[PDB]
């Protein structure tokens, strides 16, 4: 257990409320839709894999995207561009070796120029007023993992998987804070694998009871059952690899019993 564990956690709980995109933002977007965002995020996953980027970078990117689209109108042809400068800024923030700009131009298949991605980078910054240290479902997941009796790796990868699905569907997940989704992803993983529930220690740590996580569990369970029928499959394919213990192949439980 690290020196500032409790402290950092309290602080992320303060920050997750400030780093929020407005929930019904897609309703006021004249041209783009949730399913488009879903295509985008899926793509960003493909990109993280190809360039062996941290999952945390993916999460940071999605947060920037949802905050940027919360206040800027974007037309469909420009959607990829926003995502590309999001991903590039997430990389610069979070990675040791971000890929270079030329590598981000390359995976847009040359839809956009270098000159553009750099201008979009500038704008994204301007719009989020340089606020990039956002808490993610991922940060809380790792933080939660330390309260594990004992460390099940399958539970870990599965929670990571479930949390990553949450990125793809703005409806309903934008309704929830990262900590809550994390809580949900964790209990759902734990159960599925070992039958155990969201432990006493976390209830003390997060203040969250199974009962307060229930609405998010209800939705996350659905997503998990419908996962192989879903239009976007990049995450399912990613979590098939041995690196992730093939967790995306495990059968969801039929009922959650709560």
């Amino acid at each position: 257990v690290p020196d500032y564990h409790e402290d950092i956690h309290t602080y992320l709980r303060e920050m997750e409320v400030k780093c929020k995109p407005k929930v019904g933002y897609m309703k006021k977007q004249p041209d783009i839709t949730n399913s488009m965002r879903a295509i985008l995020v899926d793509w960003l996953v493909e990109v993280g894999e190809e360039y062996k980027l941290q999952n945390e970078t993916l999460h940071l990117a999605v947060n920037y995207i949802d905050r940027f689209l919360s206040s800027m109108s974007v037309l469909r042809g420009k959607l990829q561009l926003v995502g590309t400068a999001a991903m590039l800024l997430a990389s610069k923030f979070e990675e040791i070796y971000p890929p270079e700009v030329a590598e981000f131009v390359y995976i847009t298949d040359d839809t956009y120029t270098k000159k553009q991605v750099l201008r979009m980078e500038h704008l994204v910054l301007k719009v989020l007023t340089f606020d990039l240290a956002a808490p993610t479902v991922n940060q809380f997941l790792t933080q939660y993992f330390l309260h594990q009796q004992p460390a099940n790796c399958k539970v870990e990868s599965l929670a990571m998987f479930l949390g990553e699905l949450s990125l793809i569907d703005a409806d309903p997940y934008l309704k929830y804070l990262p900590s809550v989704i994390a809580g949900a992803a964790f209990h759902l993983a734990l159960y599925t694998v070992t039958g155990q529930s969201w432990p006493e220690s976390l209830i003390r740590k997060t203040g969250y009871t199974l009962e307060s996580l229930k609405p998010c569990l209800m939705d996350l369970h659905q997503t998990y059952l419908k996962a192989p029928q879903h239009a976007q499959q990049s995450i399912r394919e990613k979590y098939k690899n041995s690196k992730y213990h093939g967790v995306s192949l495990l059968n969801p439980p039929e009922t959650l019993n709560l």
Binding site: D3, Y11, K92, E121, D131
Partner: protein, 296 residues
């Protein structure tokens, strides 16, 4: 950008020129980092992404205040509160007498509080050195220059290795460990603590291996007893000379028993054993801390 009359170059930073300037309209004195963009290669450096975005979170009286970011077409300017001078220039100007002990105690207390806030807000500074510590006329000291900082995770994972200025770099980085966290900042502060007491840098090496030997020669060459796992670190060599640990009252003579105790805790080879910023504030060396004004 036109409300400012630049007065002079004051500093260099790791990533851009710093000026003293004044607001023509409010009269306010400020410091201006110029970060050079030049447009078409890599855009805005990760360096600045980190610095601005962390500094916005880190509002605390022992951390420099960022007032504004002027985000032009060609350049980025970070506008900071102006502080009179750096600890470095203050130390050079105090070489013959030395800084009064109560002032050292205060500077250390204040710095430790700045660092505690950083670490509790998941930030490693990674460049704590005397020309990055800023002092005003009313007895305050503030951590500055977050160009090399980053947000760390719980647990940590591998970060960048090319980290911290040589004289202040912790042994776990020198020896090539996979993982380092907050302890790297404490080590640096330890060296700084010692520097304020002796007027000389504690471990002033000129290369990675020279730095290692300067640490060994003072603190004793580390072994499994003192630091479990040293001998199997990537850049450890069994052929490292085996010097004995020197007695603290020789290393840092002016210190009392409390100062030595605290110093020895900051300079522990084992990052896991090294004292935290928060725990350090509880140290009995601070039971009588005041706020002296510097003899400028």
């Amino acid at each position: 950008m036109e409300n400012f009359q630049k007065v002079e170059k004051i500093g260099e930073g790791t990533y851009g020129v710093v000026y003293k300037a004044r607001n023509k309209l409010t009269g306010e004195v400020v410091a201006l980092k110029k970060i050079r963009l030049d447009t078409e290669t890599e855009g805005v450096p990760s360096t600045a992404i980190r610095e601005i975005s962390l500094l916005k979170e880190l509002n605390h009286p022992n951390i420099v205040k960022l007032l504004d970011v002027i985000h032009t077409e060609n350049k980025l300017y970070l506008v900071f509160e102006f502080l009179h001078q750096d600890l470095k220039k203050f130390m050079d100007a105090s070489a013959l007498t030395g800084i009064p002990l109560p002032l050292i105690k205060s500077y250390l207390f204040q710095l430790l509080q700045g660092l505690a806030f950083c670490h509790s807000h998941r930030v490693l500074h990674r460049d704590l050195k005397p020309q990055n510590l800023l002092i005003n006329t009313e007895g305050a000291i503030k951590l500055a220059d977050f160009g090399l900082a980053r947000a760390f995770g719980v647990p940590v994972r591998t970060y960048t290795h090319e980290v911290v200025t040589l004289w202040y770099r912790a042994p776990e980085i020198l020896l090539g460990c996979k993982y380092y966290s907050t302890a790297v900042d404490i080590w640096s502060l330890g060296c700084i603590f010692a520097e304020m007491v002796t007027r000389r840098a504690l471990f002033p090496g000129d290369s990675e291996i020279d730095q290692l030997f300067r640490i060994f020669r003072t603190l004793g060459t580390p072994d499994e007893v003192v630091w479990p796992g040293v001998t199997s670190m990537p850049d450890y060599k069994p052929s490292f000379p085996k010097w004995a640990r020197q007695d603290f009252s020789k290393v840092v003579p002016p210190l009392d028993e409390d100062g030595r105790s605290l110093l020895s805790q900051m300079l522990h080879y084992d990052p896991n054993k090294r004292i935290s910023a928060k725990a350090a504030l509880a140290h009995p060396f601070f039971q009588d801390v005041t706020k002296p004004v510097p003899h400028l």
